[PDB]
Amino acid sequence: MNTVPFTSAPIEVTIGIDQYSFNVKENQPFHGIKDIPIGHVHVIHFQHADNSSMRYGYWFDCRMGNFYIQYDPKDGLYKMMEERDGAKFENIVHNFKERQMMVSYPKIDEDDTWYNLTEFVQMDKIRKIVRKDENQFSYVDSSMTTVQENELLKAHSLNYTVINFKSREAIRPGHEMEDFLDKSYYLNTVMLQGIFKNSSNYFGELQFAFLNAMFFGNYGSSLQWHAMIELICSSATVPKHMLDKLDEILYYQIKTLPEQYSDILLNERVWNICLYSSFQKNSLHNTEKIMENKYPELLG
């Protein structure tokens, strides 16, 4: 299907669906979101009126089942659920009067923003990162730490591939100076060939990390997104089309960020290195341009 119904909206909440956002008044007859473009992952996210620091939400793919949202009194949270296929369900969810109480997913923008933010993101990879369980959708919130964050402090965590520059996995014995300065071995042998297998899987996790940082204020995800960028930029040897694609991917991401700088969304230190010092800095034409236009404060 392409509708995500809500049982009701008993409490005031700001609802995000992908990059769009609307407010639902307490007990306003609201019964969900209709006309969702099938065949991209999607994310629905929530922020309550009384809670500013806490965002929470669900990544899902409408091709994998029928999902709906139900408010849980115990928890005071909106929860995603799966509903088994059925004629009766279809008939209530597609009823004209019911659909009049739903908000329509906005007609696609000519920049094709969502597709460009999620081109490489795949629901099955998302489930491997977030939690392998009985649900086909994945819960994320502002507080979830990453496996990496969990180790820096020496199952409810974000299992991103750990990208550790100071680690011995980054340095070949006998190449201590070379691999410290040039991350090509780490990027190509360890990460691309060993772990991700290809650049699409690498970009998928980079895109997912970015979206979590942005929609949930998840710092661990911001950390991951920056690390994945810096790993490419600080490698003297990068597969040909990978560099060109990265500039385009980053451009859309920077474009979608809020106008107000936030140090949990953009890392000034890393961005200054990538844009102005890194080996691949010249490959980031479009990204550099929008970064300077949008956030001159951070850059000089």
Q: Are strands 56-60 and 42-48 parallel, antiparallel or unpaired?
A: antiparallel
206: domain range? 144-300
Closest by CA position to 253, among listed 297, 300, 215, 196:
215
Instruction: Specify the resolution in Å.
Output: 2.1
Q: Mind giving me the DSSP string for 39-104?
A: SS-EEEEEEETT-SS--EEEEE-GGG-EEEEEEETTTTEEEEEEE---HHHHHHHS-HHHHTTSEE
Same domain flag for 85 and 150: no
Name the residue with tokens 């969702």: 36
Question: Quick one: 43 and 153 in the same domain?
Answer: no
Q: Do 60 and 199 have their domain in common?
A: no
Q: Looking at the structure, tell me whether residues 3 and 97 fall in a common domain.
A: yes
φ/ψ of 219, rounded to 5, equals -65, -45
CATH of the domain at 23: 2.60.34.20
Spatial distance between the Cα atoms of 215 and 159, rounded to a whole number of angstroms: 18
Which tokens belong to 165?
A: 């520059």
- 266 shares a domain with 119: no
Q: Write out the two tokens for 203.
A: 């970009």
What CATH number is associated with residue 214? Answer: 1.25.40.550
The verdict on 133 and 198 lying in the same domain is: no
* Whether residue 272 is found in the same domain as residue 183: yes
CA dist 124 and 52 (Å) reads 30
Could you say which of 113, 143, 173 is where a domain stops? 143
Question: How determined?
Answer: X-ray
Residues 148 and 265 in one domain: yes
Residues 124 and 158 in one domain: no
Total domains, the chain = 2
Place of tokens 């299992």: 159
Residues in the chain: 300
8 Å CB contact between 271 and 291: yes
Tell whether the torsion through CA atoms of 108, 110, 199 and 236 is positive or negative: negative
In DSSP notation, 233-298 reads HT-S---HHHHHHHHHHHHHHHHHS-SS--TTT--HHHHHHHHHTSTTGGG-HHHHHHHHHH-HHH
Based on the fold, state whether residues 171 and 241 are members of the same structural domain: yes
d(CA 248, CA 253): 9
Q: How many angstroms from the chain centroid is the CA of residue 262?
A: 17
Torsion of CA 164, 166, 167, 171, to 10 degrees: 110
What is the torsion angle, in degrees rounded to the nearest 10, for the CA atoms of residue 60, residue 253, residue 46 and residue 222? 100
Domain boundary pick from 85, 112, 143: 143
* Phi, psi at 69, each rounded to 5°: -115, 140
261 phi/psi in degrees, rounded to 5:
-55, 135
Residue where a domain terminates, one of 108, 143, 178: 143
**Residues sharing a CB contact under 8 Å with residue 260, sequence separation 6 or more, in sequence order:** none
Residues 191, 138 within the same domain: no
Q: What angle do CA 90, 68, 209 make, to 5 degrees?
A: 135
Name residues whose C-beta falls within 8 Å of residue 194's C-beta, 6 or more positions apart in sequence: none
6 burial type by CB count under 10 A (0-12 exposed, 13-18 middle, 19+ buried): buried
**CB atoms inside a 10 Å sphere around CB 80:** 19
Alpha-carbon distances of 183 from 18, 179, 188, rounded to whole Å: 34, 6, 9
Q: 273 and 241 share a domain?
A: yes
User: Whole-angstrom Cα distance, residue 139 to residue 60?
Assistant: 9
Task: Give the separation between CA 149 and CA 158, rounded to whole angstroms.
Answer: 9
Distance of CA 266 to the CA centre of its chain: 14
Nearest to 146 by CA among 220, 228, 216: 220
DSSP state of 137: S
Residues in Cβ contact with 75 at an 8 Å cutoff, skipping those fewer than 6 apart: none
